[PDB]
Amino acid sequence: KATYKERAATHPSPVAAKLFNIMHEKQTNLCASLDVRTTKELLELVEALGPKICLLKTHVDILTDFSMEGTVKPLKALSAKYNFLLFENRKFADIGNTVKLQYSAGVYRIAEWADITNAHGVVGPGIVSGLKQAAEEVTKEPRGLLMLAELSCKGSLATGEYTKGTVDIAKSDKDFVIGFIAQRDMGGRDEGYDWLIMTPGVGRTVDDVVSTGSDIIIVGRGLFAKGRDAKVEGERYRKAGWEAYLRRCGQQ
Amino acid sequence: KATYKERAATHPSPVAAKLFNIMHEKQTNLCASLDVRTTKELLELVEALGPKICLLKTHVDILTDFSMEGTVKPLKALSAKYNFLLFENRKFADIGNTVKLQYSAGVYRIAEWADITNAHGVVGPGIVSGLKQAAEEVTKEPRGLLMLAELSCKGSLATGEYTKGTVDIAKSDKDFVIGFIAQRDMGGRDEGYDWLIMTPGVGLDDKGDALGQQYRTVDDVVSTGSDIIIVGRGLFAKGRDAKVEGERYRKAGWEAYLRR
Ligand SMILES: O=c1cnn([C@@H]2O[C@H](COP(=O)(O)O)[C@@H](O)[C@H]2O)c(=O)[nH]1
Ligand SMILES: O=c1cnn([C@@H]2O[C@H](COP(=O)(O)O)[C@@H](O)[C@H]2O)c(=O)[nH]1
């Protein structure tokens, strides 16, 4: 693949280009996935990890005290201060006005602040066109979507065929669908697609996933649980992921 | 398949047994799927459709004025008065505490009032065990789950292999997973399973109605294996009389069932 810097200069999606630039500038391909109960704990961890991440994956549905004023406002401020994007967990899986409103409205109003979101492909391309239309009506700010091509939960049904079908759906909109949550490269280069591959469950080792084609490593509890120091772990994983990236052979 | 009455007598799920009995007693296998924007319109439609349905499928996420006091309270009252169950649309698709709270909390607190809910099987059996645990913690009332085995939306990935995988996940809990949202019979009888097959997208081939003719007919789906017909806008859109349409579809669905 091309370097993050190169991909930022050519990508059709403004959000993807913005993310690739952050990665190049901050020398990080680390995404911190934080699943905590309170806004206080969330903001604490984000403050500590901000300098070392390119992306923050939030889990607003498990927060007990989510609010636009108390959660989103300070989170957006941290995003701006430390320069990283916001990716909300909510795994959309519907179409039409139902999915548009689950994304744009409700108490969470995800589309108003989440730079990136993800969707299950099982419901068909309607989830892509629906979320795209909702994003456009909500804000002029760049928005992008990741398809959940390969899941890692036990007994998941994201088989080869399902993944192939998901990749095909992604090809319907290279402007809005910026990549996948997956465990391996999804190809596409020969066809003019440049997909971001974000891989969770990293601790498989960083070297393993980055070598197989992962562009971003999504690390969760390994960064803050069990009395760990998030600032220290943020640097550990950032260094590991960046060095693995530098060792990978780029397109010459 | 055996009759609805017979199936109710031997079903392991209290919710499915309750539903099958409602179907037999009211002579209906009709589920009204309402996707209106206001609670006022919803309550009006439910009142009109109550006597003719066995199940009401709500779409709370599109309501512009949802409230536990103004929406759920009256809905439960109608459910008790007219004897039908509540099925909320929310297509759950995650696991662990995330899916548990999406089902139990938030402003909607779905588990507190929805007799039946549905889940995508793609995430694995964890969605079944998680929703089940949440249901037990939230209320003493019995709860049931439907797996989204076959989707009708354009370009969906509910292929034969995906459907088989979803059916296998349902087999993991016969007490909680009562059936599927599907377009055909899912079998299981030889294995000791009695799944409710609920099928959306049904029409009556009305004269001059190209829109409704895009859908399979009631006779087609029921004679093929569907147990419940999920009818949408054909019940109330275009200035239609919901009570009249409710009876039309109930009649068609029941007659097709008896023919079966
Ligand atoms: O301590 C943990 C537990 N889970 N995960 C991983 O996170 C993903 C699930 O995250 P999600 O709830 O955001 O989908 C899976 O890949 C799982 O291995 C972690 O990173 N850390
Ligand atoms: O007027 C309509 C529009 N859609 N549907 C059908 O309803 C389902 C969508 O329902 P859901 O939003 O509750 O999933 C699909 O099968 C679709 O063909 C109807 O029954 N009538």
Side-chain angles (χ1 to χ4, degrees), chain A residues 160-211:
Chain A
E161 187 77 300
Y162 181 86
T163 302
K164 293 288 295 185
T166 298
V167 174
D168 289 318
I169 286 174
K171 294 188 184 68
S172 73
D173 197 327
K174 62 176 177 56
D175 287 347
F176 191 58
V177 179
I178 67 177
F180 311 97
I181 281 292
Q183 291 296 312
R184 63 192 171 79
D185 182 71
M186 294 285 101
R189 295 173 285 285
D190 290 357
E191 295 63 62
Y193 296 100
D194 180 12
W195 294 310
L196 272 159
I197 302 301
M198 306 200 197
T199 305
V202 178
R204 302 171 61 194
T205 66
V206 173
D207 293 326
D208 174 32
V209 303
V210 173
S211 298

Short mmCIF file of all heavy atoms in Angstrom, two decimals, chain A residues 160-211:
data_model
loop_
_atom_site.label_atom_id
_atom_site.label_comp_id
_atom_site.label_asym_id
_atom_site.label_seq_id
_atom_site.Cartn_x
_atom_site.Cartn_y
_atom_site.Cartn_z
N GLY A 160 -16.62 -15.90 4.73
CA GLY A 160 -16.00 -15.39 3.52
C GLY A 160 -17.03 -14.78 2.59
O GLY A 160 -16.82 -13.71 2.03
N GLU A 161 -18.15 -15.48 2.42
CA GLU A 161 -19.22 -15.02 1.54
C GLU A 161 -19.83 -13.72 2.06
O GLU A 161 -20.07 -12.79 1.28
CB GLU A 161 -20.31 -16.08 1.44
CG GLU A 161 -21.39 -15.76 0.42
CD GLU A 161 -20.94 -16.01 -1.01
OE1 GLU A 161 -19.95 -15.40 -1.46
OE2 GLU A 161 -21.59 -16.84 -1.69
N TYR A 162 -20.07 -13.66 3.36
CA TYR A 162 -20.65 -12.47 3.98
C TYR A 162 -19.70 -11.30 3.81
O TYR A 162 -20.13 -10.18 3.49
CB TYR A 162 -20.90 -12.71 5.48
CG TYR A 162 -21.53 -11.53 6.19
CD1 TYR A 162 -22.92 -11.35 6.20
CD2 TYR A 162 -20.74 -10.56 6.81
CE1 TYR A 162 -23.50 -10.24 6.82
CE2 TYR A 162 -21.31 -9.45 7.43
CZ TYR A 162 -22.69 -9.30 7.43
OH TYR A 162 -23.25 -8.19 8.03
N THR A 163 -18.41 -11.54 4.01
CA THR A 163 -17.42 -10.50 3.87
C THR A 163 -17.35 -10.03 2.42
O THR A 163 -17.26 -8.84 2.14
CB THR A 163 -16.03 -11.00 4.33
OG1 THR A 163 -16.12 -11.43 5.69
CG2 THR A 163 -14.99 -9.88 4.22
N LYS A 164 -17.40 -10.98 1.48
CA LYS A 164 -17.37 -10.63 0.07
C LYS A 164 -18.55 -9.72 -0.24
O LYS A 164 -18.42 -8.72 -0.94
CB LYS A 164 -17.43 -11.88 -0.81
CG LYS A 164 -16.21 -12.79 -0.70
CD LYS A 164 -14.98 -12.19 -1.37
CE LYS A 164 -15.18 -12.07 -2.88
NZ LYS A 164 -13.95 -11.59 -3.57
N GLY A 165 -19.71 -10.08 0.30
CA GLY A 165 -20.91 -9.30 0.08
C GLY A 165 -20.80 -7.91 0.68
O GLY A 165 -21.31 -6.94 0.11
N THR A 166 -20.15 -7.81 1.83
CA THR A 166 -19.97 -6.52 2.49
C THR A 166 -19.02 -5.63 1.69
O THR A 166 -19.26 -4.42 1.55
CB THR A 166 -19.41 -6.70 3.91
OG1 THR A 166 -20.35 -7.46 4.69
CG2 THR A 166 -19.18 -5.35 4.57
N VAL A 167 -17.96 -6.22 1.17
CA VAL A 167 -17.00 -5.46 0.37
C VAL A 167 -17.70 -4.93 -0.88
O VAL A 167 -17.48 -3.80 -1.29
CB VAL A 167 -15.79 -6.35 -0.03
CG1 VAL A 167 -14.87 -5.59 -0.98
CG2 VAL A 167 -15.02 -6.77 1.22
N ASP A 168 -18.57 -5.75 -1.47
CA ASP A 168 -19.30 -5.34 -2.66
C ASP A 168 -20.19 -4.14 -2.36
O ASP A 168 -20.34 -3.24 -3.18
CB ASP A 168 -20.13 -6.49 -3.21
CG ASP A 168 -19.28 -7.58 -3.84
OD1 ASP A 168 -18.31 -7.24 -4.56
OD2 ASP A 168 -19.58 -8.77 -3.62
N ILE A 169 -20.80 -4.13 -1.17
CA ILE A 169 -21.65 -3.02 -0.78
C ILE A 169 -20.80 -1.76 -0.63
O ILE A 169 -21.21 -0.67 -1.03
CB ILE A 169 -22.38 -3.32 0.55
CG1 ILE A 169 -23.49 -4.34 0.31
CG2 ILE A 169 -22.95 -2.04 1.15
CD1 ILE A 169 -24.17 -4.81 1.58
N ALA A 170 -19.61 -1.92 -0.06
CA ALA A 170 -18.70 -0.79 0.12
C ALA A 170 -18.34 -0.13 -1.21
O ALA A 170 -18.20 1.09 -1.30
CB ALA A 170 -17.43 -1.25 0.83
N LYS A 171 -18.20 -0.95 -2.26
CA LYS A 171 -17.85 -0.43 -3.58
C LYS A 171 -18.92 0.49 -4.16
O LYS A 171 -18.66 1.21 -5.12
CB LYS A 171 -17.60 -1.58 -4.55
CG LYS A 171 -16.39 -2.43 -4.22
CD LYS A 171 -16.12 -3.41 -5.35
CE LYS A 171 -14.97 -4.35 -5.03
NZ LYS A 171 -15.33 -5.28 -3.94
N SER A 172 -20.12 0.47 -3.58
CA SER A 172 -21.20 1.31 -4.08
C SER A 172 -20.99 2.79 -3.77
O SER A 172 -21.65 3.65 -4.36
CB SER A 172 -22.54 0.87 -3.49
OG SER A 172 -22.64 1.23 -2.12
N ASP A 173 -20.09 3.09 -2.85
CA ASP A 173 -19.86 4.49 -2.51
C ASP A 173 -18.48 4.72 -1.90
O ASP A 173 -18.31 4.67 -0.68
CB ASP A 173 -20.93 4.96 -1.52
CG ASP A 173 -21.03 6.46 -1.43
OD1 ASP A 173 -19.99 7.14 -1.59
OD2 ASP A 173 -22.14 6.97 -1.19
N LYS A 174 -17.49 4.98 -2.75
CA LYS A 174 -16.14 5.22 -2.25
C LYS A 174 -15.99 6.59 -1.61
O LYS A 174 -14.99 6.88 -0.95
CB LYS A 174 -15.10 5.06 -3.36
CG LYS A 174 -15.25 6.03 -4.51
CD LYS A 174 -14.12 5.87 -5.51
CE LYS A 174 -14.31 6.78 -6.71
NZ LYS A 174 -14.43 8.21 -6.29
N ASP A 175 -17.00 7.44 -1.78
CA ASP A 175 -16.95 8.78 -1.19
C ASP A 175 -17.32 8.73 0.29
O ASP A 175 -16.75 9.47 1.10
CB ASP A 175 -17.93 9.71 -1.91
CG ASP A 175 -17.45 10.11 -3.29
OD1 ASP A 175 -16.27 9.88 -3.60
OD2 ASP A 175 -18.26 10.68 -4.05
N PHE A 176 -18.27 7.86 0.63
CA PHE A 176 -18.74 7.75 2.00
C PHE A 176 -18.23 6.54 2.78
O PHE A 176 -17.95 6.65 3.97
CB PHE A 176 -20.28 7.75 2.01
CG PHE A 176 -20.88 7.91 3.37
CD1 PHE A 176 -20.59 9.02 4.16
CD2 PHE A 176 -21.78 6.96 3.85
CE1 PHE A 176 -21.18 9.18 5.42
CE2 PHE A 176 -22.38 7.11 5.10
CZ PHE A 176 -22.07 8.22 5.89
N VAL A 177 -18.11 5.39 2.13
CA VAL A 177 -17.61 4.19 2.82
C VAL A 177 -16.08 4.23 2.70
O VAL A 177 -15.51 3.96 1.65
CB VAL A 177 -18.17 2.89 2.21
CG1 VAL A 177 -17.61 1.68 2.94
CG2 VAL A 177 -19.69 2.89 2.32
N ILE A 178 -15.44 4.56 3.81
CA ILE A 178 -13.99 4.71 3.85
C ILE A 178 -13.18 3.47 4.19
O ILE A 178 -11.95 3.48 4.08
CB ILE A 178 -13.60 5.84 4.83
CG1 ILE A 178 -13.95 5.44 6.27
CG2 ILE A 178 -14.34 7.11 4.46
CD1 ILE A 178 -13.52 6.47 7.31
N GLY A 179 -13.85 2.41 4.59
CA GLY A 179 -13.13 1.20 4.93
C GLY A 179 -13.93 0.19 5.71
O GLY A 179 -15.16 0.19 5.67
N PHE A 180 -13.21 -0.65 6.45
CA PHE A 180 -13.84 -1.73 7.20
C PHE A 180 -13.24 -1.97 8.57
O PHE A 180 -12.11 -1.58 8.85
CB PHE A 180 -13.67 -3.05 6.45
CG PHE A 180 -14.05 -2.99 5.01
CD1 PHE A 180 -13.07 -2.82 4.04
CD2 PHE A 180 -15.37 -3.13 4.62
CE1 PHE A 180 -13.41 -2.78 2.69
CE2 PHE A 180 -15.73 -3.10 3.28
CZ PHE A 180 -14.75 -2.93 2.31
N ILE A 181 -14.04 -2.64 9.40
CA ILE A 181 -13.60 -3.11 10.69
C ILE A 181 -13.38 -4.54 10.19
O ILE A 181 -14.33 -5.19 9.74
CB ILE A 181 -14.74 -3.12 11.74
CG1 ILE A 181 -14.97 -1.70 12.29
CG2 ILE A 181 -14.40 -4.09 12.87
CD1 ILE A 181 -13.82 -1.16 13.13
N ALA A 182 -12.13 -5.00 10.21
CA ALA A 182 -11.82 -6.34 9.71
C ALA A 182 -10.51 -6.83 10.30
O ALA A 182 -9.80 -6.06 10.95
CB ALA A 182 -11.73 -6.32 8.18
N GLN A 183 -10.21 -8.10 10.07
CA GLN A 183 -9.00 -8.74 10.58
C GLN A 183 -7.91 -8.94 9.54
O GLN A 183 -6.82 -9.42 9.86
CB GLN A 183 -9.36 -10.10 11.19
CG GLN A 183 -10.16 -10.03 12.47
CD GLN A 183 -9.40 -9.36 13.59
OE1 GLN A 183 -8.24 -9.69 13.85
NE2 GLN A 183 -10.05 -8.43 14.28
N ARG A 184 -8.21 -8.60 8.29
CA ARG A 184 -7.24 -8.77 7.21
C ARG A 184 -7.49 -7.78 6.09
O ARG A 184 -8.52 -7.10 6.08
CB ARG A 184 -7.33 -10.20 6.66
CG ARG A 184 -8.67 -10.55 6.03
CD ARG A 184 -8.81 -12.04 5.77
NE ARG A 184 -10.18 -12.39 5.37
CZ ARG A 184 -10.67 -12.22 4.15
NH1 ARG A 184 -9.92 -11.71 3.19
NH2 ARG A 184 -11.94 -12.55 3.90
N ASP A 185 -6.55 -7.71 5.16
CA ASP A 185 -6.68 -6.81 4.02
C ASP A 185 -7.91 -7.23 3.22
O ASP A 185 -8.22 -8.41 3.13
CB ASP A 185 -5.44 -6.89 3.14
CG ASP A 185 -5.50 -5.94 1.96
OD1 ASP A 185 -5.40 -4.71 2.18
OD2 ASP A 185 -5.65 -6.43 0.82
N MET A 186 -8.60 -6.25 2.63
CA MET A 186 -9.80 -6.52 1.85
C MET A 186 -9.60 -6.24 0.35
O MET A 186 -10.58 -6.19 -0.40
CB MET A 186 -10.96 -5.67 2.37
CG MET A 186 -11.43 -6.03 3.79
SD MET A 186 -12.39 -7.56 3.87
CE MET A 186 -11.16 -8.71 4.45
N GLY A 187 -8.35 -6.06 -0.06
CA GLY A 187 -8.05 -5.79 -1.46
C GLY A 187 -8.64 -4.47 -1.93
O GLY A 187 -8.70 -3.51 -1.16
N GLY A 188 -9.04 -4.42 -3.19
CA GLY A 188 -9.64 -3.22 -3.74
C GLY A 188 -8.74 -2.28 -4.52
O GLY A 188 -9.22 -1.51 -5.35
N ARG A 189 -7.44 -2.34 -4.26
CA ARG A 189 -6.48 -1.47 -4.93
C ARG A 189 -6.52 -1.56 -6.46
O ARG A 189 -6.53 -0.53 -7.15
CB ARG A 189 -5.07 -1.76 -4.41
CG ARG A 189 -4.90 -1.42 -2.93
CD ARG A 189 -3.55 -1.87 -2.38
NE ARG A 189 -3.49 -3.32 -2.18
CZ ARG A 189 -4.08 -3.97 -1.18
NH1 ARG A 189 -4.79 -3.30 -0.27
NH2 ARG A 189 -3.98 -5.29 -1.08
N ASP A 190 -6.55 -2.77 -6.99
CA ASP A 190 -6.59 -2.97 -8.44
C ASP A 190 -7.86 -2.38 -9.05
O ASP A 190 -7.93 -2.15 -10.26
CB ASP A 190 -6.52 -4.46 -8.78
CG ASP A 190 -5.16 -5.06 -8.51
OD1 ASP A 190 -4.24 -4.31 -8.11
OD2 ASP A 190 -5.01 -6.28 -8.70
N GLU A 191 -8.86 -2.14 -8.22
CA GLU A 191 -10.14 -1.60 -8.68
C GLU A 191 -10.32 -0.11 -8.38
O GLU A 191 -11.38 0.45 -8.65
CB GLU A 191 -11.29 -2.40 -8.06
CG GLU A 191 -11.36 -3.86 -8.50
CD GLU A 191 -10.14 -4.67 -8.09
OE1 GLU A 191 -9.89 -4.80 -6.87
OE2 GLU A 191 -9.42 -5.18 -8.98
N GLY A 192 -9.29 0.52 -7.82
CA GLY A 192 -9.39 1.95 -7.54
C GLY A 192 -9.95 2.31 -6.17
O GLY A 192 -10.37 3.44 -5.94
N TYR A 193 -9.97 1.34 -5.27
CA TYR A 193 -10.47 1.59 -3.92
C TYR A 193 -9.29 1.62 -2.96
O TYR A 193 -8.33 0.87 -3.12
CB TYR A 193 -11.44 0.48 -3.51
CG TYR A 193 -12.69 0.43 -4.37
CD1 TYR A 193 -12.80 -0.51 -5.39
CD2 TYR A 193 -13.73 1.33 -4.17
CE1 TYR A 193 -13.93 -0.54 -6.21
CE2 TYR A 193 -14.87 1.31 -4.98
CZ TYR A 193 -14.96 0.37 -6.00
OH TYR A 193 -16.06 0.35 -6.82
N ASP A 194 -9.38 2.50 -1.97
CA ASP A 194 -8.33 2.63 -0.96
C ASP A 194 -9.03 2.59 0.39
O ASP A 194 -9.39 3.61 0.96
CB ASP A 194 -7.60 3.96 -1.13
CG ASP A 194 -6.50 4.16 -0.11
OD1 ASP A 194 -6.16 3.18 0.59
OD2 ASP A 194 -5.97 5.29 -0.01
N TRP A 195 -9.23 1.38 0.88
CA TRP A 195 -9.94 1.19 2.14
C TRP A 195 -9.12 1.16 3.41
O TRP A 195 -8.07 0.50 3.48
CB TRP A 195 -10.78 -0.09 2.06
CG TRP A 195 -11.89 -0.01 1.07
CD1 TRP A 195 -12.82 0.99 0.94
CD2 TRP A 195 -12.25 -1.01 0.10
NE1 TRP A 195 -13.73 0.67 -0.04
CE2 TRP A 195 -13.40 -0.55 -0.57
CE3 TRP A 195 -11.70 -2.25 -0.26
CZ2 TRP A 195 -14.03 -1.29 -1.59
CZ3 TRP A 195 -12.32 -2.99 -1.27
CH2 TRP A 195 -13.47 -2.50 -1.92
N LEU A 196 -9.60 1.88 4.41
CA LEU A 196 -8.97 1.91 5.72
C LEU A 196 -9.33 0.58 6.38
O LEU A 196 -10.50 0.20 6.42
CB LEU A 196 -9.53 3.06 6.55
CG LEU A 196 -8.87 4.43 6.43
CD1 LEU A 196 -9.83 5.52 6.88
CD2 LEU A 196 -7.60 4.45 7.27
N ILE A 197 -8.32 -0.13 6.89
CA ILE A 197 -8.57 -1.38 7.57
C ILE A 197 -8.29 -1.16 9.05
O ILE A 197 -7.15 -0.94 9.45
CB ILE A 197 -7.65 -2.52 7.04
CG1 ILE A 197 -7.87 -2.70 5.54
CG2 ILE A 197 -7.94 -3.81 7.80
CD1 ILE A 197 -9.30 -3.04 5.14
N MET A 198 -9.34 -1.18 9.86
CA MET A 198 -9.20 -0.98 11.29
C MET A 198 -9.46 -2.32 11.97
O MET A 198 -10.52 -2.90 11.79
CB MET A 198 -10.17 0.08 11.79
CG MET A 198 -10.06 1.37 11.02
SD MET A 198 -10.73 2.76 11.90
CE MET A 198 -10.90 3.93 10.57
N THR A 199 -8.49 -2.77 12.75
CA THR A 199 -8.57 -4.08 13.38
C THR A 199 -8.58 -4.09 14.90
O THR A 199 -7.65 -3.61 15.54
CB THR A 199 -7.39 -4.93 12.91
OG1 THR A 199 -7.39 -4.98 11.48
CG2 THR A 199 -7.47 -6.35 13.47
N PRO A 200 -9.64 -4.66 15.50
CA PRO A 200 -9.76 -4.74 16.96
C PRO A 200 -9.16 -6.05 17.46
O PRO A 200 -8.74 -6.90 16.66
CB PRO A 200 -11.26 -4.68 17.18
CG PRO A 200 -11.77 -5.48 16.03
CD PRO A 200 -10.94 -4.97 14.86
N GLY A 201 -9.12 -6.21 18.78
CA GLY A 201 -8.57 -7.42 19.36
C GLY A 201 -7.07 -7.50 19.20
O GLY A 201 -6.52 -8.57 18.93
N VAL A 202 -6.40 -6.36 19.36
CA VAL A 202 -4.95 -6.30 19.23
C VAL A 202 -4.27 -6.15 20.58
O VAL A 202 -4.70 -5.36 21.42
CB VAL A 202 -4.54 -5.12 18.33
CG1 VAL A 202 -3.02 -5.04 18.22
CG2 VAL A 202 -5.16 -5.30 16.95
N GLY A 203 -3.21 -6.92 20.78
CA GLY A 203 -2.47 -6.87 22.03
C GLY A 203 -1.01 -7.26 21.85
O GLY A 203 -0.18 -7.02 22.73
N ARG A 204 -4.42 -11.07 18.76
CA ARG A 204 -3.29 -11.04 17.84
C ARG A 204 -2.36 -9.88 18.20
O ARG A 204 -2.81 -8.86 18.71
CB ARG A 204 -3.79 -10.89 16.40
CG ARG A 204 -4.74 -11.99 15.95
CD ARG A 204 -5.37 -11.66 14.61
NE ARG A 204 -4.37 -11.52 13.55
CZ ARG A 204 -4.61 -10.97 12.37
NH1 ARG A 204 -5.82 -10.50 12.08
NH2 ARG A 204 -3.64 -10.88 11.47
N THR A 205 -1.07 -10.06 17.93
CA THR A 205 -0.09 -9.02 18.24
C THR A 205 -0.13 -7.88 17.24
O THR A 205 -0.65 -8.03 16.13
CB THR A 205 1.35 -9.58 18.24
OG1 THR A 205 1.69 -10.00 16.91
CG2 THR A 205 1.46 -10.77 19.18
N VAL A 206 0.42 -6.74 17.63
CA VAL A 206 0.47 -5.58 16.77
C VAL A 206 1.21 -5.93 15.48
O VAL A 206 0.73 -5.67 14.38
CB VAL A 206 1.18 -4.41 17.46
CG1 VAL A 206 1.38 -3.26 16.47
CG2 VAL A 206 0.38 -3.94 18.66
N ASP A 207 2.39 -6.53 15.62
CA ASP A 207 3.20 -6.89 14.46
C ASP A 207 2.43 -7.80 13.51
O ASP A 207 2.51 -7.65 12.29
CB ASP A 207 4.50 -7.58 14.88
CG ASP A 207 5.44 -6.64 15.62
OD1 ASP A 207 5.46 -5.44 15.28
OD2 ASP A 207 6.17 -7.11 16.52
N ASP A 208 1.68 -8.73 14.08
CA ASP A 208 0.89 -9.66 13.28
C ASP A 208 -0.15 -8.95 12.42
O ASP A 208 -0.13 -9.07 11.20
CB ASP A 208 0.23 -10.68 14.21
CG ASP A 208 -0.72 -11.62 13.49
OD1 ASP A 208 -0.47 -11.94 12.31
OD2 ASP A 208 -1.70 -12.05 14.12
N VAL A 209 -1.03 -8.17 13.05
CA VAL A 209 -2.07 -7.47 12.31
C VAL A 209 -1.56 -6.43 11.31
O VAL A 209 -2.04 -6.36 10.18
CB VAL A 209 -3.09 -6.80 13.27
CG1 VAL A 209 -3.69 -7.85 14.20
CG2 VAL A 209 -2.42 -5.71 14.08
N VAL A 210 -0.59 -5.62 11.72
CA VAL A 210 -0.06 -4.60 10.82
C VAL A 210 0.62 -5.23 9.61
O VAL A 210 0.55 -4.70 8.50
CB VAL A 210 0.93 -3.67 11.54
CG1 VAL A 210 1.59 -2.72 10.54
CG2 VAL A 210 0.19 -2.86 12.60
N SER A 211 1.27 -6.37 9.82
CA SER A 211 1.96 -7.06 8.74
C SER A 211 0.98 -7.67 7.74
O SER A 211 1.28 -7.77 6.55
CB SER A 211 2.85 -8.17 9.30
OG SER A 211 3.85 -7.63 10.14
#
